[PDB]
């Protein structure tokens, strides 16, 4: 039921919205999971790892260079915005709204959401492997050597860039190698961030899971904490919702359609 949800939303004063890659997908962003989700000869699972990077940064950086460039044509969908706008609209009235996101494409930032938690980091942030610095980087290309590389076709020859010519630490007192400031397979999330999230969720009195479901990583680390306090949780996604055992607020179908009505 819709209007049920709407009356919590009315009453509620600290809202916490968790976004999956469903929302990213709704903006035309590729996400490399299962059914047709390859890049050249590999799936994400192969490339998004620390070893893959140690062992072939040219290639990893191609993959990531490509992902950075695709965002150039990919805009925030209506969800991304309704959120940003709702965050802003509510804040005006001293009402809190925070986004917690598995996505790394800065699309919330571009819709203009502010109190946001990028828990996998971001494509447009860099980490120096030597000194550890984290600066934002939206350069296109991030460096000359990659200029128009990273093409997605199975066949494409590898750029095969020498490491010295991959992106480096501009603080030339170091000049270390940069990597995408992204969480990879077999890497832990930032304890600092989780503490802040844990705080934020504990404060919330309405939680939204968007373009994903409560039952899978990463939503499933959080939804319990808030549900366990009796705080209502509402899914907005494409997962179908069986006969008889419908949840208290599932909102099946594309976020871009479903959510702006819900939040207005």
């Amino acid at each position: 039921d819709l209007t049920a949800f709407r009356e919590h939303f009315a009453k509620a004063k600290h809202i916490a919205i968790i976004t999956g890659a469903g929302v990213s997908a709704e903006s035309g962003v590729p996400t490399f999971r299962g059914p047709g989700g390859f890049w050249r000869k590999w799936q994400a699972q192969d490339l998004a790892t620390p070893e893959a990077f140690s062992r072939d940064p040219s290639l990893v950086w191609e993959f990531y260079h490509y992902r950075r460039e695709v965002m150039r044509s990919k805009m925030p969908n209506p969800a991304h915005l309704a959120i940003a706008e709702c965050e802003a609209r509510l804040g005006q009235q001293g009402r809190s709204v925070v986004i917690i996101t598995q996505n790394i494409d800065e699309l919330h930032h571009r819709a203009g959401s502010k109190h946001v938690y990028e828990i996998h980091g971001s494509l447009f942030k860099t980490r120096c492997m030597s000194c550890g610095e984290v600066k934002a980087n939206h350069k296109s290309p991030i460096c000359p050597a990659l200029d128009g590389k990273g093409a997605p076709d199975p066949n494409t020859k590898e750029a095969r860039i020498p490491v010295e010519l991959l992106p480096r630490c501009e603080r030339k007192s170091c000049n270390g190698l940069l990597r995408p400031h992204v969480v990879w397979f077999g890497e832990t999330l930032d304890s600092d961030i989780l503490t802040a999230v844990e705080r934020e969720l504990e404060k919330c009195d309405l939680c939204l899971v968007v373009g994903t479901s409560s039952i899978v990583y990463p939503a499933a680390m959080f939804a319990p904490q808030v549900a366990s306090r009796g705080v209502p949780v509402a899914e907005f996604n494409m997962e179908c919702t069986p006969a008889t055992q419908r949840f208290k607020y599932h909102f099946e179908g594309p976020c871009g359609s479903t959510l702006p009505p819900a939040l207005e």
Partner: peptide, 8 residues
């Protein structure tokens, strides 16, 4: 620290 996808 929490692994990504709990290890998978």
């Amino acid at each position: 620290x929490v692994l990504x996808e709990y290890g998978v």
